[PDB]
Amino acid sequence: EDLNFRKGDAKTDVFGSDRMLQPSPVERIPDGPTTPEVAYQMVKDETFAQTQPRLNLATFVTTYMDDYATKLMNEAININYIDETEYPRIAVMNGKCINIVANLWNSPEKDTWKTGALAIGSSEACMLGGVAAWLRWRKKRQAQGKPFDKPNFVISTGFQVVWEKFAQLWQIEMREVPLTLEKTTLDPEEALKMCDENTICVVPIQGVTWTGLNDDVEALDKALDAYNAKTGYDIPIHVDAASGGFILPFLYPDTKWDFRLKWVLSISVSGHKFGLVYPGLGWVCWKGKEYLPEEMSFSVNYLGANITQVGLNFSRPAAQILGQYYQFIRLGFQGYKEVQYNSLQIAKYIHGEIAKMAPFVNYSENVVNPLFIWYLKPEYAKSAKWTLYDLQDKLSQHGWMVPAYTLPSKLEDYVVMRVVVRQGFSRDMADMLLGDIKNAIAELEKLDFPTPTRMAQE
Amino acid sequence: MEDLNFRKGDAKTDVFGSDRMLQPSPVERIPDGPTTPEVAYQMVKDETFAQTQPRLNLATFVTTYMDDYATKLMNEAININYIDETEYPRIAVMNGKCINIVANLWNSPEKDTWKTGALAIGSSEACMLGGVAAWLRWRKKRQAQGKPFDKPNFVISTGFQVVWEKFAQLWQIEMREVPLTLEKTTLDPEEALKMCDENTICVVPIQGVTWTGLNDDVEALDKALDAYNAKTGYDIPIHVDAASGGFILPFLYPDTKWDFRLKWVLSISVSGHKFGLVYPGLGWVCWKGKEYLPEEMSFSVNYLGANITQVGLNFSRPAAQILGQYYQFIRLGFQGYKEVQYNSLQIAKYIHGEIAKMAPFVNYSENVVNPLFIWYLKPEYAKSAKWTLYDLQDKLSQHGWMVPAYTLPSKLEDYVVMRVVVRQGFSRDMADMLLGDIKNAIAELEKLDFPTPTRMAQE
Amino acid sequence: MEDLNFRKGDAKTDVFGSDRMLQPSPVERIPDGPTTPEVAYQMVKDETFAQTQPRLNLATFVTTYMDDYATKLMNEAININYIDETEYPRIAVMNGKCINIVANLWNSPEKDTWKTGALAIGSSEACMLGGVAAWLRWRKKRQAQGKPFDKPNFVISTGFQVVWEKFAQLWQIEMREVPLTLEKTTLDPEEALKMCDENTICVVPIQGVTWTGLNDDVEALDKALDAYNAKTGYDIPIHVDAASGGFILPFLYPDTKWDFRLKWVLSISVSGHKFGLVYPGLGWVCWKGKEYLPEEMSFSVNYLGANITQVGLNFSRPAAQILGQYYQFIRLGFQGYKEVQYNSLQIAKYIHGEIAKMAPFVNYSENVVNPLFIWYLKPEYAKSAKWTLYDLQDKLSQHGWMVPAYTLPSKLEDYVVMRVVVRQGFSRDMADMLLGDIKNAIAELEKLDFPTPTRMAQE
Amino acid sequence: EDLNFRKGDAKTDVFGSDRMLQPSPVERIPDGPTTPEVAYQMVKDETFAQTQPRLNLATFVTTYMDDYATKLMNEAININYIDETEYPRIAVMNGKCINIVANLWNSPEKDTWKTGALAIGSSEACMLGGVAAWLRWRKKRQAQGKPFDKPNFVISTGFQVVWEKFAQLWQIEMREVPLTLEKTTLDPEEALKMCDENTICVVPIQGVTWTGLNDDVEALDKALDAYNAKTGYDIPIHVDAASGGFILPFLYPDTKWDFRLKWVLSISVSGHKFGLVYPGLGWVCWKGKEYLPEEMSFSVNYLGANITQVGLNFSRPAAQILGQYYQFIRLGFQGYKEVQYNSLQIAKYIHGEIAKMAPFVNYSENVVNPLFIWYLKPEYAKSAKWTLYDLQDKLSQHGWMVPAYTLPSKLEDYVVMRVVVRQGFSRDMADMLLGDIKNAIAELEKLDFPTPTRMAQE
């Protein structure tokens, strides 16, 4: 007999111990330790009762990489990127990723080491782009003797929340262009009507989270050029290309959306979205060194590489840099093209199967990113007992997360549902999703009474 | 017999018999085409060999070792995006539980079950959130008083970590710096108060100053600030930058009054990936109460009955560091944290005392309160020495160590110092290897007949 | 809920919160008592961190990389004792097949299916077996002729590897050395013959001289020895020390007559753990035929139809390397070996040519025939330089490399040279990293206003 | 259809390929490559049809280490010990192992860094000990003006073959002292009768491979002291403690066999036997630096450690050094004592169960190493139709290797069987062995006719 079996000794079975008869700590650190096996199960077992990542169809963020990328990143778990003097090869590798991304966006910058910065995601990358735009504008107005205490920026109502965070945490006024059925993306004329002497930039979006579409950056550039020539306000573009920045160079190389455009001075992207790297990666590039203010930034030479030192974060995992460089070499341009081709084709397939179903109609006929949205046909929705919120709940019962939500301003009456196709979501998994949707439709159509969300829409 | 595509990357290719491994890695542009995973894996991996090994990086404060079970747990969470809280509500609750545990480690008087605080990637984000909040609370007060609010400043030691300079740059807030001297090796509150005025948004004492390893005396600052605030009505608060010290003091110095026990400490930040014992990617910031976190910055969403504050500079991010932090709280508990930090501090104190015995060296402080310390050359020894600590740094790097030498901040910029940080996973046996290499390096440098370049640069 | 024995090593102990990790590792005496495996694992593992990583060790000729399948196969054989041939007869046969394959790579004319040869731990044991065999054949021939046989000698370049000095010392056999000059950068046959007499047991040309990377011309020696032997009747044979070149020449230089194609080459040795591409612990020695391996040294036992020679200095030993060798033969074949060695030699030639373009350097040879080469400072640059190749070695060590600087053997002792060995797993990309580090080290060393200790020691 | 499926492409199944219809190469390197999976199987599959290491009861060499030792050694597979400038911490660790072994043997040497050498096994360690003994004798005889060209050494007929290799490869005369049932180990007086002015050393054995016994080193030391004072020949002892060198210090600390004895000037041992490390480890220690000739050796200071550079091998795996240092720290003295206690207890147990069986009688009543030998009772053997060779074959049918062999000279008529108990052979496995032996006896006792080996004994 083992006296200390239940107390956590060498013979203890995790699930015959006192600790596994006790709740996990909510408020205070436990007074004492447990065995690693007990602690591992206590933390791990709490993650079972939620969405499995590969079935999370709400997220744009990578939920699969191959075995070699995963191994490489796991092996780098203890590498702090910011220790660049200690790890100068990763600092150089970061600079090469930035060069590769800037050249993917057709940067005209002649310096070997392109002007850009590592980020944890598009959040930090967007804020860096916006702060730079803010500082360039402050300096311009100061030289002109104009006031500089009431800046604004212009964006679609389809903005992702980081631009609201940017507005709040820096106290810069956000001016929003509404969406309508006639203008499903940023309309340049309406955007221009909100520009004045205090606008620091206009922010078109490539891969709008709410809709899956792309704002027309070239059309914005065109309108902005004539306006800037009229007023001298010199208003630039920052492209929020969180998803599209790793779609368009491979699948739409001739679409002029990037540094080929005169007024596109900076671009940001989520490397952890369609850059195909696990969470923790964004990039922001400037068209040239002259668009990155000295007040924000400096550069350090590491092994002959000029590495720009700008960022909101400091210490951070380096794994995602290795992961990014791995994807660039392992796939190359052709490999990225074929992976994004697969993701886009599966999205268009699901899009076309959704359109064949009696309850549904797609927001757009054109799928330009590996995602799309649909809603209930208005005449179907009128007499239906259910809403898309009910469909989301039905699908979650099979482990899927397929989100239903209302669109931004002037389309707030439209409840839509979104599917994001990422690498690792196959045609076979699409068929399973489509079968579950068909079954959910059949069950919901048996309702004799309206659901609560159906009643709330009345 | 012969395999036609052996060199081009087929199923029979040997990585190092291939054309790709006769070619340089891409510097400017994505390669046109793919390679095999094995080739690409080696191309990226092999570039990380020629640099400091993490366990021998003694410059860094950030965790380079966790146990096998924490490591496995975090690797298994590599594809989990924290910010997908609706999809992963159990991790959102776990995040709120870590914040509670941290706030209570800091003796928060907040009565709400779900404490006011936020996840961060490191003390960089956590400090900026603390500073933006102090700035917004100050703007609101001055606006309500009819006073100007366009020229904010904050007060901090010259021993600040660079994120406070970034904060000053990226928000255009004036940083006022209190210099270090040998008479005042940490932030002196009276000199701190001399830089306070109606435009001061907060004072930032530091627990675990990166340059020196010391702690600013937060309680002494709180006392001076209390009298000053009673005199002026400016209501200047404290944000404690406890990047390292926030996970040392609760366990090793429970009676040092530095945290939410003090009247004017309204927020505190810490690096979970330093002495919180989690691999890179974790910080925490807590507020003394919900009233100190402006609604302009923040909201909260209920996930499975837990009120989780949605404030942050980042959005999508790895969730593994939350599982790792919660694992350490459960696996070690208070006693286990105390015993690990005791080990790290004892080893730092051991090296500190061994350093003091060697003829060329003298310690900046006799008090080791965090698992790190700094030393410099005895002035009388340095005058006739042919070498500097930069030469010692280079000697040690030849054996794989990174032991950094650098000049101290303002009014001590003449002092070249060297720093050793003891982290979990750096043992007494490894300290003996370091000390042996230091002794051997000293004996080699003492044979020099001519001064080194850095020695001449000091002349 | 405190754990009383947490620091003493129970089921809850954290390695780096334990008393054991506050104590030094044992230097003199076995510790009195046990620890947990996790603690002991770290204590041993952590001592290996502070040294050169194998893939950046450019001094070594010995394999530092094999693919994942070879590595898995060898790890799985860690508990297999080769010498237990009755218990493990398939490995004994596998060893015999490896010996057959090596003998045929060297164009053995031996008609027996099972070639006469022996497993070794490296070229050290393989060379000693070859030399003892030559010594015994010589003793027997001199005895039958009624001549003395008590003062044997052998002839070799001053570029010998240290095993031949051990052979000379441990068997008390006189080693006669032919010096190197710039005019005779490898073994000159005429000078070698002038050191032969009636007591010379063999001449040892070297394929892959460690000091230089060059090949002694075996065919020229064989030709010279043939005429010498016809004149004197001394009947002196060749043993080829082909430690590196024995797995280079068959694939990249098939037409160079250096092996058993030559009349007087009676035995050849090689390091299987060098360019045979197997992890440490493998060498081979083959004889031209059974009549050249004395029965006094040897016997043969039949295992499963395989005639296995039982010759060796070692007895019990790891079997993993046999599996590793046979795997490489099957996995790569002739073509795969050819392409791997081609990559290594091409990268060595690439580094060789880039070094020649740098102002301080000049290469020892314009011919690169093994995946390694040496260079030194241009005499005119060296006169006024403040630094030596020893200073460059130390600088490159600061980035984790080991690139050795050393003086050449006799009559070239004045030459300080530096050597790079390119092994499987050293790519073009890693070469670019090395060359970049060299360029940077030169620019730093060129800033010196005073000479270094080694530069002064050169007077 | 996949055109290249059988030829080795990415879709090839190893056992649907042409290569797995072809024999493995016997004579010549294949002209071309295969896939790693095919090559892995081809080599691996050849190792199945032989004794499994844990059931190999012939071997004295370690067949089990724990998971941490095993992982530690695997991780060092690419580490060449001899690169001591590159790997100076392993050179220091090697020196610490030599110190620990030297003190385990009660070395009186005052130096911190004990005089000793790493080996691949007892073979190299014994040859180093014998070469040193040989060189010291040459120097002594030369200084006296005496001849030194006809060396000999004295050893039991129970020598292990390396001493024959030493005799052959160095051309030194081996003088053998026979075993008898009256003198089951080396008799000192018989040993002394073969010594003269040309004897370089006497070699007692601790853990004789043939018998499991220990030569009485202390009795040899006493007799050698009186002989040396009479003749002045100054003949020393080298102890071949291949097995016993890691048994006696823990289980028989009071037995005086090591450097405590005046004439024991060197001792060798197999670290890969009862030192508990996987194949590839030996040690030799000298009583002091004056007993290791400089002609054989030099010393290099690595990080303050004086490391002796003597050895027959050069480049070699360093993994075994880590494994040895791991075992010293992981087990300590107590842990070694308890592990060797277990192995010895199990051997004593099997020994006692063998003695109870009608056909058998043990060679010795005292088990002093974890091994022993037995033979057939003389009267049982006379009428039995089977021999121990037949028992060996029967046990091989169940996967065991339990060897039968004739003892060396003057016991050449004795066919014996040996069992070696190593770490990893438990009481439970001993019961399994004993059950198979019992079953085998019942089968062989049914023979109506004698076996080939039984007739060969007639």
Ligand SMILES: *Cc1c(COP(=O)(O)O)cnc(C)c1O
């Ligand atoms: C992803 C997203 C963001 C926020 O990016 P993160 O990578 O989550 O930090 C901003 N804008 C758009 C269009 C996005 O899709």
Ligand SMILES: *Cc1c(COP(=O)(O)O)cnc(C)c1O
């Ligand atoms: C670590 C550090 C910081 C920055 O924190 P990160 O975790 O690197 O983001 C700020 N202040 C101090 C005192 C620090 O030690």
Ligand SMILES: *Cc1c(COP(=O)(O)O)cnc(C)c1O
């Ligand atoms: C490698 C080497 C040796 C010694 O061989 P090991 O494999 O280290 O035992 C002998 N001669 C030459 C030319 C060598 O390169």
Ligand SMILES: *Cc1c(COP(=O)(O)O)cnc(C)c1O
């Ligand atoms: C093991 C053995 C040897 C040979 O030792 P290895 O470790 O196989 O090289 C020599 N003598 C005895 C008594 C042995 O048991």
Ligand SMILES: O=C(O)CCCC(=O)O
């Ligand atoms: O992809 C995600 O998980 C979040 C980023 C986009 C969004 O806000 O929905």
Ligand SMILES: O=C(O)CCCC(=O)O
């Ligand atoms: O610990 C690190 O690796 C960086 C922390 C902040 C600093 O030291 O400036």
Ligand SMILES: O=C(O)CCCC(=O)O
């Ligand atoms: O390659 C090695 O690691 C040793 C080889 C022999 C030598 O260089 O002397």
Ligand SMILES: O=C(O)CCCC(=O)O
């Ligand atoms: O134990 C072995 O595997 C061989 C050891 C030497 C022997 O007993 O012959």
